Amino acid sequence: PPGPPGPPGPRGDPGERGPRGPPGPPGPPG
Amino acid sequence: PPGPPGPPGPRGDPGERGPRGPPGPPGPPG
Amino acid sequence: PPGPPGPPGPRGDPGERGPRGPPGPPGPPG
Numbered sequence: 001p002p003g004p005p006g007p008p009g010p011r012g013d014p015g016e017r018g019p020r021g022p023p024g025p026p027g028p029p030g
Numbered sequence: 031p032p033g034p035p036g037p038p039g040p041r042g043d044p045g046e047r048g049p050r051g052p053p054g055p056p057g058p059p060g
Numbered sequence: 061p062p063g064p065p066g067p068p069g070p071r072g073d074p075g076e077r078g079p080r081g082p083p084g085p086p087g088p089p090g
Contacts, residue, residue: 003033003063009070012042018078021051025083030060030090033066042075049081057090 001062002031003065005034006036006066006068008036009039009068009072011040012072013074014043015045015075015077017045018048019080020049021081021083023052023083024054024085024087026055027057027087028089029057031063033063035067036069038070039072041073044076045078047079047081051081051084053084054087056088057086059090
């Protein structure tokens with residue numbers, strides 16, 4: 001009969017680094 | 031006859047977290 | 061008779077982009 005299935009394929013390519021975060025809040029009130 | 035291909039590999043790893051955002055603006059006068 | 065094993069499966073799907081970076085620090089004091 002047909003042979004067993006092959007092994008799982010290799011892991012996909014890793015993703016790019018995440019985007020830079022937003023600016024912080026305004027500083028403390030004077 | 032030869033067996034079929036295996037299943038797809040695992041999904042790629044996510045990218046690492048993005049870098050910290052810029053400083054916020056100066057605080058208001060008070 | 062039993063067939064030879066199949067070939068490796070397809071390469072996995074690409075990894076996602078990493079998460080958004082953290083916010084920046086607070087600005088200077090007012």
